[PDB]
Amino acid sequence: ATLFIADLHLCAEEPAITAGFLRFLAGEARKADALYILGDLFEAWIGDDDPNPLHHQMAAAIKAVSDSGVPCYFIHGNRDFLLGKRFARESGMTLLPEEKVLELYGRRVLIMHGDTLCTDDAGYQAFRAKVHKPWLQTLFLALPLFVRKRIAARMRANAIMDVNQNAVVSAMEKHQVQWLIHGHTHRPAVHELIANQQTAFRVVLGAWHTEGSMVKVTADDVELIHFPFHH
Amino acid sequence: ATLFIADLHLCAEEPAITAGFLRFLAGEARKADALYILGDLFEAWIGDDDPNPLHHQMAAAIKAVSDSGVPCYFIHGNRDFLLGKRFARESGMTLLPEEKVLELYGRRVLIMHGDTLCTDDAGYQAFRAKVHKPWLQTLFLALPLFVRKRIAARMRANAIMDVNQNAVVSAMEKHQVQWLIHGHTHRPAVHELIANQQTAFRVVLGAWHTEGSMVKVTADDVELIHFPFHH
Ligand SMILES: CN(c1ccccc1C(=O)Nc1ccc(S(=O)(=O)N2CCN(c3cc(Cl)cc(Cl)c3)CC2)cc1)S(C)(=O)=O
Ligand SMILES: CN(c1ccccc1C(=O)Nc1ccc(S(=O)(=O)N2CCN(c3cc(Cl)cc(Cl)c3)CC2)cc1)S(C)(=O)=O
Numbered sequence: 001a002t003l004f005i006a007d008l009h010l011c012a013e014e015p016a017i018t019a020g021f022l023r024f025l026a027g028e029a030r031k032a033d034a035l036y037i038l039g040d041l042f043e044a045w046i047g048d049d050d051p052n053p054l055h056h057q058m059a060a061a062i063k064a065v066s067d068s069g070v071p072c073y074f075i076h077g078n079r080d081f082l083l084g085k086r087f088a089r090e091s092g093m094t095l096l097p098e099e100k101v102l103e104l105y106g107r108r109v110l111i112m113h114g115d116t117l118c119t120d121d122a123g124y125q126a127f128r129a130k131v132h133k134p135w136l137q138t139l140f141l142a143l144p145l146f147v148r149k150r151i152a153a154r155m156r157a158n159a160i161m162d163v164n165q166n167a168v169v170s171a172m173e174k175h176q177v178q179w180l181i182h183g184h185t186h187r188p189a190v191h192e193l194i195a196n197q198q199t200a201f202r203v204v205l206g207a208w209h210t211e212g213s214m215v216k217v218t219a220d221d222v223e224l225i226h227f228p229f230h231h
Numbered sequence: 232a233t234l235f236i237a238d239l240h241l242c243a244e245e246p247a248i249t250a251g252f253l254r255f256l257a258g259e260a261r262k263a264d265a266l267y268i269l270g271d272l273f274e275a276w277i278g279d280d281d282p283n284p285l286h287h288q289m290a291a292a293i294k295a296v297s298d299s300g301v302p303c304y305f306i307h308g309n310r311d312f313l314l315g316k317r318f319a320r321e322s323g324m325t326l327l328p329e330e331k332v333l334e335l336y337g338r339r340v341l342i343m344h345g346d347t348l349c350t351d352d353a354g355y356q357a358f359r360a361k362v363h364k365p366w367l368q369t370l371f372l373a374l375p376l377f378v379r380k381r382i383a384a385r386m387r388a389n390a391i392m393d394v395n396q397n398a399v400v401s402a403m404e405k406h407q408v409q410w411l412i413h414g415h416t417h418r419p420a421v422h423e424l425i426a427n428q429q430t431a432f433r434v435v436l437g438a439w440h441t442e443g444s445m446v447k448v449t450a451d452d453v454e455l456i457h458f459p460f461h462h
């Protein structure tokens with residue numbers, strides 16, 4: 001199967017989640033055709049030059065997957081939009097655009113983090129628009145690391161709005177798909193809807209905390225799977 | 232794996248759900264070690280003498296699973312507590328008590344429909360207590376079929392309360408388990424909790440409508456899986 005995960009929100013303060021992720025990478029992921037990480041892999045990102053040991057540990061673990069013959073891909077989330085080409089190289093991941101149609105076993109599937117669908121959160125969308133400006137990213141990344149951390153602390157100190165259903169249909173009609181997989185909203189579920197005047201499905205991943213979750217796609221099956229961290 | 236499903240609420244008026252169930256029985260179920268149906272297989276049951284064609288269709292489909300070498304088991308729900316030894320024989324299913332500990336790959340797992348945990352719904356628990364009296368079941372079943380239908384229509388005409396968390400811990404301590412699988416509440420989820428002063432897990436199945444759901448247990452994994460009806 002092809003696997004999709006999102007919303008791991010990895011951080012030093014939550015080692016149980018990291019352990020769960022390492023188990024997933026060392027086991028489940030090795031049997032996959034490909035692995036797609038649809039954003040919020042990390043709880044925060046202020047640049048690829050950050051010496052946070054968790055980053056290099058995760059890079060090595062993800063690179064082990066692609067080195068074993070399982071291609072890995074990443075779409076940015078709202079937490080980790082500054083994850084860059086250096087980390088992608090270190091982790092063996094291919095960076096994808098914010099919205100991407102895959103051809104999976106003949107099925108067209110739209111993938112994204114999901115935050116672009118949450119059009120009712122005006123405050124979040126204003127934030128997203130600003131921090132996605134390349135010139136501002138470049139300027140931020142040019143600050144001293146210690147300053148970026150001070151900004152981050154305040155910004156992190158400074159409930160996730162669910163998707164707008166019209167935005168969902170709009171996106172699925174734009175991309176001409178009957179399948180959409182995303183995360184962001186932390187509301188794991190399978191939804192049936194109508195797009196392109198045909199039955200359509202939206203499959204939502206969950207955040208990693210007590211459980212992990214993944215979506216498995218094969219030719220004949222699409223499954224949303226939750227698993228507790230019980231090892 | 233060993234499979235668990237619940238809350239299919241099968242009825243003539245919802246053929247899409249029946250089709251989804253037939254696909255599950257003809258495919259997924261055949262690969263299983265065993266199949267456990269944890270109640271609310273049917274939307275209603277007024278006795279095994281009911282000539283509803285759906286009942287015989289489902290009996291044949293379930294019996295095909297056990298005849299292929301996959302043992303099937305049933306725990307009653309609140310909808311189908313009158314499902315009896317005749318239907319069990321016709322369907323090749325073994326009837327289990329309302330609460331049962333399984334030994335699955337060395338792991339003790341408590342299974343039940345889930346309604347016994349919903350102790351905050353006084354009206355439901357009063358109903359359950361009365362209709363579980365064997366003498367009343369026997370008397371009801373002795374009514375003419377057409378009368379049972381008239382009673383049923385009114386009773387069906389006459390939101391599901393979630394579990395009581397204390398009832399959960401109580402049950403898991405009573406049965407000395409760290410794992411519980413149930414349905415009834417139509418809130419599919421994986422929960423972590425504490426029972427027997429140790430980490431415990433409660434895995435909840437969902438109702439069948441737009442999606443099906445199952446729990447898969449192997450030696451190393453416990454998974455809650457949702458799948459859309461997309462065939
Ligand atoms: C949904 N989320 C939001 C809702 C509303 C508004 C914002 C968010 C949100 O994602 N905030 C958020 C996202 C990431 C981060 S961070 O990784 O610490 N970091 C990202 C990089 N930042 C940054 C980027 C630019 Cl180019 C310019 C500047 Cl000066 C600063 C600093 C903050 C800090 C905060 S939430 C509740 O999860 O925070
Ligand atoms: C959670 N549910 C309840 C909540 C509160 C109270 C009751 C229920 C509930 O399960 N009701 C319910 C359950 C089954 C059925 S039924 O299958 O049509 N049928 C079952 C058999 N009945 C019956 C049994 C005895 Cl031995 C005596 C009598 Cl004279 C009657 C008739 C009704 C009809 C109604 S819910 C909302 O799903 O109905």
Ligand SMILES: [Mn+2]
Pocket residue numbers: 007008009040077184185186207
């Ligand atoms: Mn997230």
Ligand SMILES: [Mn+2]
Pocket residue numbers: 039040077078079113115183184185
């Ligand atoms: Mn997000």
Ligand SMILES: [Mn+2]
Pocket residue numbers: 238239240271308415416417438
């Ligand atoms: Mn039910």
Ligand SMILES: [Mn+2]
Pocket residue numbers: 270271308309310344346414415416
């Ligand atoms: Mn029930």
